[PDB]
Amino acid sequence: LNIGKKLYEGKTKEVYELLDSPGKVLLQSKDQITAGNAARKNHLEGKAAISNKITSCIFQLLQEAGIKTAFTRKCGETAFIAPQCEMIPIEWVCRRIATGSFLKRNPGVKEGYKFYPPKVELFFKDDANNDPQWSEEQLIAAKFCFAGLLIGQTEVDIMSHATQAIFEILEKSWLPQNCTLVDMKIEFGVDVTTKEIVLADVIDNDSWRLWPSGDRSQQKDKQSYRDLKEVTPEGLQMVKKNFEWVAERVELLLKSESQCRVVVLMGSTSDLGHCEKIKKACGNFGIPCELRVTSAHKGPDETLRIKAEYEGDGIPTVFVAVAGRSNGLGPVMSGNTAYPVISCPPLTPDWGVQDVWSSLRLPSGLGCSTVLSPEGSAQFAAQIFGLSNHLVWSKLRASILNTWISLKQADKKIRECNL
Amino acid sequence: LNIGKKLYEGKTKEVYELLDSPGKVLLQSKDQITAGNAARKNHLEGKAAISNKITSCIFQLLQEAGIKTAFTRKCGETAFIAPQCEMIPIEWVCRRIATGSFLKRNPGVKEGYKFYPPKVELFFKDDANNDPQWSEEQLIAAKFCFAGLLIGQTEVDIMSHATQAIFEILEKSWLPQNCTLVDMKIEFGVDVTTKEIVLADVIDNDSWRLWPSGDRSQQKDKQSYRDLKEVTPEGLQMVKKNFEWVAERVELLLKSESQCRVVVLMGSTSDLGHCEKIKKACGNFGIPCELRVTSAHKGPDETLRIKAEYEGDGIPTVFVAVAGRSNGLGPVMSGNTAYPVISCPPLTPDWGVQDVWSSLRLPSGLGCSTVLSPEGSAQFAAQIFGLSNHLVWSKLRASILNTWISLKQADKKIRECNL
Ligand SMILES: Nc1c(C(=O)N[C@@H](CC(=O)O)C(=O)O)ncn1[C@@H]1O[C@H](COP(=O)(O)O)[C@@H](O)[C@H]1O
Ligand SMILES: Nc1c(C(=O)N[C@@H](CC(=O)O)C(=O)O)ncn1[C@@H]1O[C@H](COP(=O)(O)O)[C@@H](O)[C@H]1O
Ligand SMILES: Nc1c(C(=O)O)ncn1[C@@H]1O[C@H](COP(=O)(O)O)[C@@H](O)[C@H]1O
Ligand SMILES: Nc1c(C(=O)O)ncn1[C@@H]1O[C@H](COP(=O)(O)O)[C@@H](O)[C@H]1O
């Protein structure tokens, strides 16, 4: 592990070059806590390890969801390796609940006002003037350029949208711990190699407000330190316990709270290719997916026996019925299970206009849905599992963001042919 | 004209009761100009008449577009009659071009930054503290109640949307005079009788920034007075000329700059009812609409002769072809005029699925469009005329607003069944 020159030095972390690794850096956390732009600063033993653990869990969580993030791997108790970025000097805040500086800048608004959707604000990084709020108009007018990327309307719109998606994913991920994510701050950078804007710096207990059971008086974040009238060593021990409480629970955000399974039932092996597309698409959402062959018309006894094997082992299941021509498979399955059934018929333009009505017009007492896209049927099945599984939900949420970013990037490209 | 007690008294106008007229008031303008919350104040002869003329033209313009507005009629040189309202103490600003206080509150943004869509801001009315900017969150938290209407999320969303629509309509209306509407301020009230939020107070030369040829140095609005280092009587005469310049041109916003006509051609008198719906709908947009009877199949010589009568008199024309069954009327018309042709076939569920393809799949060199809704065909024809006629455009723009407000009101009603 061949460390090079000190590239940047902050109040709680240092970034070093790696002579062994082109375009990667090491972020070393420090045993230091700070607040405000006066002399609130303190040595706190174990803080480097707590900070590094939290940002390492959180970045792994966001990266595995599909959020583009400056994170390679954890690297000992107190550092992590990241792709080298040029930092954008903006603090991006997202709020679910109005507290803190939102109340100061908006007198009359009360503690607890809820933002639907979550509110995004920008602060320019400058300690000298205590990080003043900026409009999007101010950020665009600054004509910032980092690793050769000019930060214009498109880039500002992307960091704004991503800030909201990242908040939403962290908010959903803390929920199973009975913790309310109130707000957070993040920073983005331009990856010097890819030129992509990515989540960067760190996310740790300085980055957010976390209320157990949504109770402010139980705050576990750095606000406990900000709020001390006087820093005593008894005060610093409470703040340390709060950091430890977060650190003891953060790894559980990477844990699945619910098992998920899709079972694709096909009436014929000639539909196998259509079924492989559903299975592959389920893999993108981290949902195990099984293929089976059964015909409602030639083997209805066996259809019900197979159904029962999946009903009976306790694993929450979505069935996808793939039957061409007169689809009896979705209907018979739909009528005989309390679990959801999705018909995804392998329609073609020859007879598809005729065949689809066998999936759509069903007798009463049948919940059976229809999704024509095979990738769509997996996505629908993911949306069902996302109601009870934060990891699936997070991949769906990040996927909304990434698709939207792709449109922005494609419109930016085509906009050039208009000059 | 039986005047009653003085109800409110401001710096430039007074509101009186009308003993003869329940729920109506008289707004009397004054020969007074003011700026800021120090001693910039001056008698200016003819200002009452200039102010009253401008707000009377502008309110007539907005009201005839379909913007809900506290305006009954002009009432002498220096007053106008209005429905009685309880004023909402918010200054609603809309901007196309960043200047003025937008530059002070956003250092770094340059004179001339364009807002797409136009930017809406709120300022709380309070002279003591110089009208501080409010967030929507602050306005909602104030829980203001006027004529019994609680001002919540829905009401704030309506005033915000209406502010933008009113700006857009004034902006479009000034364009034919080569004047750039840069920004404006308006106020809304709750009509004490209807309980509807309506545009109120006044719109005059104090209300906006108007740049001839988009040149700031040619400003014709009250900014000319705000900007004087020292008020001299030579300075006040320039400001008076600027007010007179606006007053001499404002009546021209009520003038049509282009003639518009729809001609509905029907193959049979059995389709007349369908044609009456198009004609009535054209009336809603102030577009004259003629009905004619001609068959492409039984009288194609006559179809072309009628076409030529409308092509030949100089009046810009949209043709609507109404032919049931195999529509030959739209095609033959489309092929023989440079003017737009819209097929609006009187489809019914009996044979409509079969009949529509005769309007849709045309030989090359035919521009002919299809609009199934008869009210839709008039609206499409209005959208075409709105490219060259600000009065039509303004009715279409106000109609977007009003329809959106109707949805907000219907969602507010149905939301009650969920409690
Ligand atoms: N990370 C930071 C910072 C921050 O960088 N603070 C330093 C001060 C400084 O470095 O200048 C400190 O006092 O901790 N301030 C707020 N937040 C977070 O951002 C969201 C907004 O908080 P608000 O704007 O309401 O203070 C909440 O989640 C804070 O934890
Ligand atoms: N009507 C007013 C007022 C206004 O009420 N002003 C008074 C002062 C006062 O009464 O407190 C005056 O100085 O004229 N200030 C701005 N505007 C208009 O609102 C938009 C925003 O202007 P900005 O906020 O940039 O000054 C532009 O069109 C101004 O003409
Ligand atoms: N096509 C089927 C099947 C089946 O295929 O099992 N069972 C009932 N149906 C038909 O659906 C309509 C609605 O019937 P219900 O909603 O009362 O079951 C009827 O015409 C029935 O014969
Ligand atoms: N249906 C009509 C008429 C007409 O009705 O006058 N004129 C040409 N067509 C047909 O449209 C197709 C496209 O032809 P063009 O686009 O080259 O006119 C052809 O098959 C033609 O016979």
UniProtKB/Swiss-Prot annotation, chains A, B:
Modified residues (Phosphotyrosine): 16
Record-linked SUPFAM superfamilies: N5-CAIR mutase (phosphoribosylaminoimidazole carboxylase, PurE), SAICAR synthase-like
Keyword Hydrolase attributed: no
InterPro entries registered for this protein in UniProt: PurE_classII, PurE_dom, SAICAR_synt/ADE2_N, SAICAR_synthetase, SAICAR_synthetase_CS
Residues modified as Phosphothreonine: 232
Result after altering residue 326 to A: Loss of phosphoribosylaminoimidazole carboxylase activity
Pfam families: AIRC, SAICAR_synt
Alphabetical UniProt keywords: Acetylation, ATP-binding, Decarboxylase, Disease variant, Ligase, Lyase, Multifunctional enzyme, Nucleotide-binding, Phosphoprotein, Purine biosynthesis
Modification Phosphoserine occurs at: 21, 101, 268
Chain coiled-coil ranges: none
UniProt-annotated stretches for the region Linker: 255-260
UniProt family annotation: In the N-terminal section; belongs to the SAICAR synthetase family.
NCBIfam families cross-referenced by the UniProt entry: purE
Function: Bifunctional phosphoribosylaminoimidazole carboxylase and phosphoribosylaminoimidazole succinocarboxamide synthetase catalyzing two reactions of the de novo purine biosynthetic pathway.
Protein known as: Bifunctional phosphoribosylaminoimidazole carboxylase/phosphoribosylaminoimidazole succinocarboxamide synthetase
